[PDB]
Design a binder for this molecule. Structure first.
Ligand SMILES: [Zn+2]
Length: 46
């Protein structure tokens, strides 16, 4: 978070991966795609 305009009511749809926000659910759905690369898992499970 940040110290400034806290406690306002950011868009109803806010990404958790990056932290972006979207006023249209759909937008978020498609956006999430952008996060189809970086993975928390290092080694490829067998
Ligand atoms: Zn995101």
């Amino acid at each position: 978070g940040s110290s400034g305009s806290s406690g306002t009511g950011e868009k109803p749809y806010e990404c958790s991966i990056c932290g972006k926000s979207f006023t249209k659910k759909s937008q978020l759905h498609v956006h999430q795609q952008i996060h189809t690369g970086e993975k928390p898992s290092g080694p490829s499970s067998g």
